[model samples]
Target: ASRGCADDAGWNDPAMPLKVYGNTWYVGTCGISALLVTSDAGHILVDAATPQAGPQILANIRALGFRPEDVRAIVFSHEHFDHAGSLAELQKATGAPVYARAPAIDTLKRGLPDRTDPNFEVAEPVAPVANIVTLADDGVVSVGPLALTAVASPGHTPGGTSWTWRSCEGDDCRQMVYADSLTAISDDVFRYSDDAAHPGYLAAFRNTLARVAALDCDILVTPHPSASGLWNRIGPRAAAPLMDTTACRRYAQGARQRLEKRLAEEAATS
Candidate 1:
C-alpha cells in the first residue's frame, strides 16, 4: 500500500527533523506535522501528533539541539487524535501550559468523542490535562522575542485554531501560517449538508475557510505537512524560493473545490 512507508518506516524516522525557516523547525512524521518555534527564553510547539509519536517528537526536538524541557507552551490546530493525541504526555514531559480556544477546552478536558466530529467512533480519551489556559480569538502568545497570533479557524473541528507569526532571518521577515485542516472529510454516515444535527457546520466552515484565504501567508504550513506543499520547498536547492504570497488563496481554493464536491455528493445521494 502507498501508506506502508508512512505507517511502517516514516512515522519515527530519525532523519525527519529539519529546520523549515529561521527559528521554526519541522519535527513530526512524514504524514503528520509538528512545528517548533523557538525563542531565547523558551519555545512554543504546535500539534503533538499521535500518542505513538510522543517520544519521537521529543527526540526530534533534541536532534535540533532543543530541549523538551525548554518548551514553555503547547498549542493545537484542532482536537483530533492524529494531531493532539499526545497532549497529556507532552504536557507532563515539558511542564508547559496548554493553550487552546474556549470551545476546545471541554473536548480536551473530557477526552471523549465529540459528537460533532465525524471520527467520533474511533476517538480515544486522552488523560484529562491540567495547567490548561484558554486563548481568545486573535490573541497573541508571546515568548521572549517570539509572538504568535492565534487565529480562530474553526470547522475541521468546532475548536479548530490556526496560528500566524513572523519568522525572520535577520532583516528579512515573512508572515508564516500554520493553517488548520480544511478537508471536508467525513464518515460514511456523516454529511456536511446535515444542518440540524451539526447546527451551523456549513456556515462556520465557510467563515473559517475565508479567514485562512485572507491570510498574508509567505510561508504556509498545515497541520499535515504535505497539504501545503511544504516538502517541495525543502529539497537540496540552496536558495529555494519558499515565499508564495498567493499560497493562502490557493490552499483555500482547493479546499473550496473539495467542499463543493462533498456537497454535490450529498445532493446526489439524497
Candidate 2:
C-alpha cells in the first residue's frame, strides 16, 4: 500500500480540501491532483497521487467533513506509479474497489508495466491494487446518487482515462471533467511514432486529443494541477470562475500542438 519516501514534500503537500462545486471536492496535493465526488450515499475518489501522499489524502478527505470510509469507489488517471501509487492504501482504507480499463488492470495488478507502456522504462512500480474492477470504455460508475463516466484518453499511458460527472449547486449544474495527462513525453528508448514497433500509438494519441477536445467540459481538472491552470480557477486567490466551457478544447489543442512538435524533434534526432 506504500513505497519509497516522497523525495519532495511538494508531492504530498497538505492542501485543505476545497469544494470545486457542489458535492465535488479537490482532495489532493497542491501539485498532483485527486478529487472526491460526493453524495449522501457514498463518494467517488479520483487518482491516489504518490504512495507517500496516502495519509495526507486521507487527512484532506476528512478535513472536508467527509469520512475516508465514505469513499465508495476509486478510479485513476493512468497506471503510472506517481498517480496510482496510493491506490492500494486508499482501497484498503475505504474498502473501495479500484475500477479501471482492461489495459490498466495488468499494471495495477503487477505494480508495474511491461513494454506496452511508453514510460515503462522509467515508470516506478506502485503497490498492487488488491480489488480491481474492469470498467468499459464508456462505462458509468454509480454510487448512490452520483454517476461518474469514464472516458478513454490513452496516450501518456495505454490505459490513461478521463472522467466526467455533473456537479450541481442548486439550479446550476456543470460538467466536471477530470482530464488525464495528454503530454507525449517518453523515455529515451521509446518513440510515440514508432508505428512499426509501437503500432498506431501516435494515431491513438491523436484520437485521444480529439476525444477530449469534443467533450462537454465545463470545469477541467488534470492529473497535474498546473496543466489546466486549476489553481487559478479555485482557491482563495482565484482569478477566474471555476467553470470554463472551452477549457477541454483549449487544453487538448495545446497538447496536440506539443505532440506534433515532439514528433518533429524525434524525426530530427533520428
Candidate 3:
C-alpha cells in the first residue's frame, strides 16, 4: 500500500493525499471548494464558483497564468447548492460547453428564486444552462486530451453523475472524480441500503460505490476537499495501486456489505 512519490514531505496519509500539480493554473473557488485540471492538450474544470468567489476564481486562474478563455470544457457531478452555485458566471466567462446529466441540468434550470442575498443565490439564470450537453447513461466524452467517462450514479440526487478519467497511457493511471454519491464526511452506510425505503437511495449509493470500484485504475479523486486528506497524492508521475483490481473490488464489496447490514438491522427494528 505504499505509494511512490516525487516529494513526500507534506504527506501524512496516502489514503487521502493532496498535491497541487498542474500547468500553474487555478480553476474555481466554490465555497464548498472546486477542482480544475490542465491536461497536455487543454483544461477541464469542475464546479465554477460560489457567488462570493465568482470573480476571484477567474483571478486565481489568471494568477496561475491561464486566461479564462483557455478553459475547454466544464462538467458538474450534480447540481447542489454548493457544487453548482456559480455555473452561469463561469460559463459566460469561458464560453465552454458544460457537460451535465439531464436531471441536474433540469434542476439548475428550475425556476428558483434569485435573491439579492449573495449567500443564497445558488441558482443561476436558466438560459445559460440550455447550452448544456446532457449526458446519457454511460456517456463518454473527450476534451482535447482528456477522456471522461460518465457514470450515472444517482443517490445524492436523481441524475447525479460521476466523472472518471483515464490518463493518456492507460488504466494504470486512471483517476476518479466522485461528487456527492459518496461522502468523505461519514462512515454511515445507512442512507445507501436497499431496504431503507426512500425511493431506493441506498440502492443508488451502493451501485455507485460498486460501479466506481469496478473501474481499473490507480487513483480516486473526490470533488470536495477531502476530510481524510486527498486523492491522487502522487500527482501523476508515480502512484501506489489505489484503484488496483484487488483494492477496487474490496472497496466495492465492503461498502455494499456495510450498507446492507446497517439497513437490515434498521429494517428489522421498523
Candidate 4:
C-alpha cells in the first residue's frame, strides 16, 4: 500500500469497453474504472482515470464507437488525481461541463488536492477545468433519460461523492451505484483516527457507510471496479446473475471492517 506514482500503470493499462448493464458501460483502464452512461442524446463519463490516461480513455470511448464530442458531462468519484486528473483535458475534448460537490469543486478549480486528501502531498497537481457545476448534497444531474442522484460519501476525501441511477434494457431495470473509494487508506504519516483537525471525519465516514449500505443497489459498481466484484460478474468465471440485491451492504461491510481495523491499529500505536 505504498503511495507511489509509477504504480499507476495498472490504472492506465488498456481494457476493452464492456457493457455492465443496459446502457452502462465500462470504458476505463484495467485498474481505474470509468463508466459511460449513454443515451441517444449524449453520454456521461464517470472518472477520467489520470491526466496521462486521458487520451487513452478517449480512444477507448471511440473503440466502443462513441464520439468523444457526444459526451455531455464529466464527473468523478472524488477529486483524486487517479480519478479526476484528466478533467481538464476530457472536458476540452467533449466540451462538457464537469460536476462535483463542494470541496471537490474547489479542488478541481484550484488544481490542487485539498489538505484533507491523503494524497495531497504526493500526487501531482492537475490543470484547472472550466464550466464546473457545483452539486448540492443530494442533488440530481440529469442527462437525457439518465438521471444520476449524488450521494455524499465523504471518507477517502471530504469531497467524495457517489452516484446512483437506474439503467434498463426492455423490461429489465437495475439500480446501479458508482460508489467512491471507501478504503481508510492514507500516507504513512497520516492517521484517520488521529486526525484532530478533521474532528468529524470518523463520524462522516460512518454515516457514509450507513447511507451506502441502505441504498437499493442491484448492480453495484465502484470507481475501482474490483471493489464491487465487477470482474466476477464478467467473462468465463462469471457465475450467477449480475444483479445482487445485497451488493451495497456487502461493499459497505468490507469498507467498514477496514476502517475499524485501521482505527484499532492507530489506537494500539498511540
Top-lDDT candidate index: 2
Go through the candidates in order and give each one's C-alpha lDDT.
0.83, 0.89, 0.53, 0.84
lDDT of 2 by residue, 1-270 (tens): 222122243766667678988888989887789999998899999999987889988999988899989889999999988799999999999999999999899999999998889888998878888899999999999999999999999899999999999999999999999999999888778887789987887898999999999999899999888888877788755778788899999999999999999999988987
Q: What is the lDDT of residue 22 in candidate 4?
A: 91
- For each of the candidates, the C-alpha root-mean-square deviation to the true structure, in angstroms, is 3.3, 4.3, 7.8, 4.2
Off by over 4 Å in 1: 1-15, 235-240
**TM-scores vs. true structure, each candidate:** 0.92, 0.95, 0.65, 0.93
Residues 89-132, candidate 1: write the lDDT tens digits. 89999999999888888878887656788667667667666778
Q: Higher-TM-score candidate among 1 and 3? A: 1
- Candidate 4 positional error at 7, Å: 14
Instruction: Give the candidates in order of lDDT, highest first.
Output: 2, 4, 1, 3
Which digits, one per residue and each the tens of the lDDT, describe model 3 over residues 164-197?
Answer: 6644333334445443435412223323343433
Candidate 3 achieves a global lDDT of 0.53
Ranking of candidates on TM-score, top first: 2, 4, 1, 3
- Candidate 1 accuracy as TM-score: 0.92
**Residue 157 CA displacement from its true place in model 2, Å:** 0.4
Candidate 4 lDDT (Cα, whole model)? Answer: 0.84
